[PDB]
Amino acid sequence: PAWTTFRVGLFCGIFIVLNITLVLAAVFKSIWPLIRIYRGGFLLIEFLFLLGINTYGWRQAGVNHVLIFELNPRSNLSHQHLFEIAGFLGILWCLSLLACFFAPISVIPTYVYPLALYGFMVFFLINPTKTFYYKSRFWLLKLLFRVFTAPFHKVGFADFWLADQLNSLSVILMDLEYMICFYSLELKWGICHKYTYGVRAIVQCIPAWLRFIQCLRRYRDTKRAFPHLVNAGKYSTTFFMVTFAALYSTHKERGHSDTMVFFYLWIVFYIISSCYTLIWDLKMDWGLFDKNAGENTFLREEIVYPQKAYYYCAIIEDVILRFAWTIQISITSTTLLPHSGDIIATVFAPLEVFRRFVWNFFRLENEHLNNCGEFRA
Amino acid sequence: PAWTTFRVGLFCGIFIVLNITLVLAAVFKSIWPLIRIYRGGFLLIEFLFLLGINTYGWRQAGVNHVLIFELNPRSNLSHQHLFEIAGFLGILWCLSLLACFFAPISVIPTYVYPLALYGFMVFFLINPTKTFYYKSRFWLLKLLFRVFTAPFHKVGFADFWLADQLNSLSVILMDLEYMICFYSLELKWGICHKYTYGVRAIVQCIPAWLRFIQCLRRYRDTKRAFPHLVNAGKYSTTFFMVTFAALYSTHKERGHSDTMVFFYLWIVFYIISSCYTLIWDLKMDWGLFDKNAGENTFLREEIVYPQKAYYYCAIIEDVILRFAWTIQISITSTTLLPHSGDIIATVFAPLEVFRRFVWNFFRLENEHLNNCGEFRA
Structure with missing residues (x-):
């Protein structure tokens, strides 16, 4: 109006x-x-x-x-x-x-x-x-x-979409839990900001849990492995990397000897989750890198947004900003850097929301164009 | 848009x-x-x-x-x-x-x-x-x-309208002249705010002069006494009241004996100018108080604005706010109250612009309705 x-x-x-x-x-x-x-x-x-x-x-x-x-x-x-x-x-x-x-x-x-x-x-x-x-x-x-209440509802598109948006806004849930923690240890006149008892991991992964169980329920209704199980494979790795970062942090705190192998295993799982989510974004959530594109060499057959420069910059933007999301999640879940924590997170959370914004415009485009998520017809 | x-x-x-x-x-x-x-x-x-x-x-x-x-x-x-x-x-x-x-x-x-x-x-x-x-x-x-450059142009309606708007925004010209005065007596590290040499009267009455000579020129082109001369009679009195307030102030300063008769004559001219402008506003600039209004007892034949409450409140508003404009002009032109000056003016200038706003909506209404100012046809 x-x-x-x-x-x-x-x-x-x-x-x-x-x-x-x-x-x-x-x-x-x-x-x-x-x-x-x-x-x-x-x-x-x-x-x-x-x-x-x-x-x-x-x-x-x-x-x-x-x-x-x-x-x-x-x-x-x-x-x-x-x-x-x-x-x-x-x-x-x-x-x-x-x-x-x-x-x-x-x-x-x-x-x-x-x-x-x-x-x-x-x-x-x-x-x-x-x-x-x-x-x-x-x-x-x-x-x-x-x-x-994911497993008890048929997954539409609004369900899957908000589950993923929450999968990007994990810092909001972390801050809600941290404030609930704080207003029990404040002074109306320091257990928080650290893994109290695994809570900074449960609250960290609860959006990954929502989306993982949603994908599992979609598999149960469809009985089709691909992609409802290869997609659960991109949200399970968040559990692995978070719990392994937390375990490595606690073992460094207690001074155990397997802290080095825990760090090696955590970096392996982090790089595997980064590459998993990246190839998934660039292949199925966006539909890019298709086998049929003459002049659209690394794009789809037909494109909706006018300037191909948009796609070509968004690709590299997601490649750079996906390694930042996993790093931010791991750092927030690991009390290793007292000073670099909560400043690297404050600098990497708005960038993560921006990445989710870009993903929203090329996921919805690919959806309307190609029925990627089998939600209609 | x-x-x-x-x-x-x-x-x-x-x-x-x-x-x-x-x-x-x-x-x-x-x-x-x-x-x-x-x-x-x-x-x-x-x-x-x-x-x-x-x-x-x-x-x-x-x-x-x-x-x-x-x-x-x-x-x-x-x-x-x-x-x-x-x-x-x-x-x-x-x-x-x-x-x-x-x-x-x-x-x-x-x-x-x-x-x-x-x-x-x-x-x-x-x-x-x-x-x-x-x-x-x-x-x-x-x-x-x-x-x-009033006397050298045929008076349209934009000319007469802006002349009157300036006749209401006299404080802006007063402040321009006062600032020009100030930035000669400032200190880059008090003759102003008083009648330097009759300048606070010339600049005070220059909008009245514009409108008075415009009315005279309209008379010269039309050769019709009414209303182009009875209207000059409502802008000449501003000259009289301002110059007589200034003379009474200067005679009170020098301590002359005729200051009392000057005050009497100034209050006479002030009340005469207030009543002149008021009856003019309510009779010719607005067309109200017409001899032909059955249910519009103190209004025109036909009215444009829906609620007659608008007219009935605007009348009394102008009756109250016209005695404030003349008082503000006289006080600004007379250096008698050092403290009440520039605070009564600061309180009475926005009220004057508001009065001019109301006058604008019922002058333009009466114009479009009845061709009050003989400007077309």
Whole structure:
């Protein structure tokens, strides 16, 4: 419409100048348990902005995300609605961060602002009224329920898609668990940030678990090995690499002798998982490297996005950014580098969400083009 | 369009949060020669916002401002374009004011920011390129030239309209002259703010002079006394009241004995000018109080704006806000109250621009409805 574009603009403007205020206040006016609680909100808001850009790219390149997602052909969500809700959550996040930097009210402590921000973010998603995108949030909530109880539902495309998006937003779950940990060891006036009791691995791999059991259930319904089992083979390796990094870290802590062979085995599993996910992305999730492309030498038969430079840069971008996701996951799950941890993670998490954005535009393209995931017909 | 609504939103958002920053910095972080240089920019930006609201009210109530203004039926300026240019100038004003409150750069003094702000505001209006509303600004500049050389041009409707708008934005000219005065008596490391040599009266009445000589020239072309001479009678009294307030102030300063009779004569001329402008507004500039209105008892035959409550509140609003304009002009022209001056003016200038906004919507309505100013046919 027009009021929606106006609100997109208003929210984007307030957001950009609030970010300027934020940078200036950070330069002038143990910070780690503070930038370890706001990283979740930051990644989520960046993901919603980039999902808006994804919806625009789909709607304009030609691919239809309304038939694929089993969405309703009327009452849709164009990119402006995602931009507006992302900008709203971003304004809320910026305000909470600024109230944490300054201290507007003296009687209220500084630990209530992350609590209040996430309370608002959760209340906006379970608002029982008929307001603030009632149908949209009540679709997303049913989808979240059908995802987090994976083996008991037939896997549509929204299920598989959100499972993978969560497979990229693992830092948000890690930060939720870390904040739940923190607000038991805070001081209303340091067991967390380390593997308390294997919890930093269970919460680290729970999206891999969701997607792995979803693929297994798709196999059970289809009784077709390929690809519902070769695809479980790309999500099981996350379990292996995470648990082996954690075991190697604990053995280095205790000073055992097999720490060297554990490091060798972990680097083997890490490189195997990186190569697995990379070849999968470049072969089945994207359909590239096809045997039938004359002038599209390393692409499909027909392409949807105009400039082949897009594909040619996205390939190498994914090749570089897939080795960063596995490294970030391993480092976050291993308490080995006290200083490089939570800064390499803070630098490699937005890059991971960006990689997931690119993967979204060339997975949905390949889907609409070739019925890669056998979901219809 | 849609990008225009987006930019309107972006500028309005940056503007609202910059105003929040401004209020907070003013509360926490001789200020008078600083809020006496930014009042011009503030009144101008408020006037452009309210002119946007005026254009919307015209375009939606039914009255056409494209035939009246002799504007081009294609390539118009809807209210969004005025909102966007007003928001842009408002962002620039807020940034200059904030750079004055803080001191981002130490080597640059604090007196260059008003200079730079007004340099930008003037360069945006004389930009010789084909960018940033080239046709709009090149119409406005030709109109400003035809206004400020009044007796040598046939008075259209844009001429008479801008002459009156300037007759309401006298504080902007006063502040321009005051800043020109100041930057000769500043210290790059107090004759101003008072009638230097009758200059605070010449600059105070120069819009009244523009409009008075325009009315005289319309009389010369039409040879019709009414109303081109009874209308000069409502702009001549500004000369009288201003010069008599200034003379009474100077005689109180020198301690002469006729200061009491000068005060009596000034209050007589002030009340006569207030009543003159009020009856004129309510009778000819608005067409209200007509002899033919059954159910519209104190209105016209036919009305354009839906709710008669609008007219009924605007009448009393103008009755109250016309006695404030004359008081503000007299006080600004008389150095009698050192403290109440420049605060009563700062409080009564935005109210005056608001009164001019209301007058614009019921003058243009009456114009399109009844051909009040004999400008066409």
